[PDB]
């Protein structure tokens, strides 16, 4: 099976995604008109991809700098640094997934409960949800990184990804069903854009996140099988694809809006 070692490329993709997310976060902080709940969740998604990219570039730098011999550190200090970087990494991943779900939920409420949207989803509840997501992502990340040697952690993190994949697919495919019913009603009165947009929203999500949770799944299911082993050594590719999520999320969620594109 092929490999894509890509050991230095992390610093490039991490810095690229850091800039792209910093622009979205700065844009929503600058435009106070962007304090709608949807843009609140899009800002929080951007800030999460920011922390993903930052934390990846941080231990990219640390690992390179140790390999260069330009840095030394005590073993215990180095392992706790590795723990703290991985806690913020895993948290900004869990919260990235939750903010993708939260945007999917906000959009779904804005369609299927369209007339009650601002009664159901409102900036108090948006901020409360954002808080719950960040604090839960940190709590669970501390648990997952502390008990990382227990297969129950990897399996729970995978079951969470599967729950977010089922959530994303169900909500956006149902939204596309209403989009197709509207396209039918429009054509009917008059006489695939959503299939494309759905295929981006779910395909980028599954193509970029899915192989990392596959890797974790195979660590649980088959830590010693040689093909599972060859997939494990591709781990750098799968994490870099998560960084590619940190690049693509601001494009697909913020910079589809003309209001964002203006600034």
């Amino acid at each position: 099976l092929e490999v894509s070692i890509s050991d230095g490329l992390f610093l490039s993709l991490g810095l690229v995604s850091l800039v792209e997310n910093a622009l979205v976060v700065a844009t929503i902080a600058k435009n106070r008109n962007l304090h709608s709940p949807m843009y609140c969740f899009i800002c929080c998604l951007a800030l999460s991809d920011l922390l993903v990219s930052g934390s990846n570039v941080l231990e990219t730098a640390v690992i390179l700098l140790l390999e260069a011999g330009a840095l030394v550190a005590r073993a215990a200090v180095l392992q706790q640094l590795d723990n703290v970087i991985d806690v913020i990494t895993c948290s900004s991943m869990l919260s990235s997934l939750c903010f993708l779900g939260a945007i999917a939920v906000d959009r779904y409420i804005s369609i299927f409960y369209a007339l009650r949207y601002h009664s159901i989803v409102t900036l108090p509840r948006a901020r409360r949800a954002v808080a719950a997501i960040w604090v839960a992502s940190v709590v669970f990340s501390t648990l997952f990184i502390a008990y990382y040697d227990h297969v129950a952690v990897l399996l729970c993190l995978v079951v969470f990804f599967l729950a977010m994949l089922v959530l994303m697919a169900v909500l956006y495919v149902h939204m596309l069903a209403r989009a197709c019913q509207h396209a039918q009603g429009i054509a009917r009165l008059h006489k695939l854009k959503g299939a494309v947009t759905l295929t981006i929203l779910l395909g980028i999500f599954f193509l970029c996140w899915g192989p990392f949770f596959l890797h974790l799944t195979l660590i649980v299911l088959c830590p010693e099988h040689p093909t599972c082993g060859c997939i494990f050594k591709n781990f750098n590719l799968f994490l870099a694809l998560i960084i590619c999520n940190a690049i693509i999320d601001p494009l697909i969620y913020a910079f589809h809006s003309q209001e964002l594109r203006r600034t």
């Binding site: 550190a73 895993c90 494990f232």
Partner: peptide, 12 residues
């Protein structure tokens, strides 16, 4: 000691 480029980069 080793720096994991993130957790679970190998079976553990």
């Amino acid at each position: 000691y080793s720096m994991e480029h993130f957790r679970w980069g190998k079976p553990v």
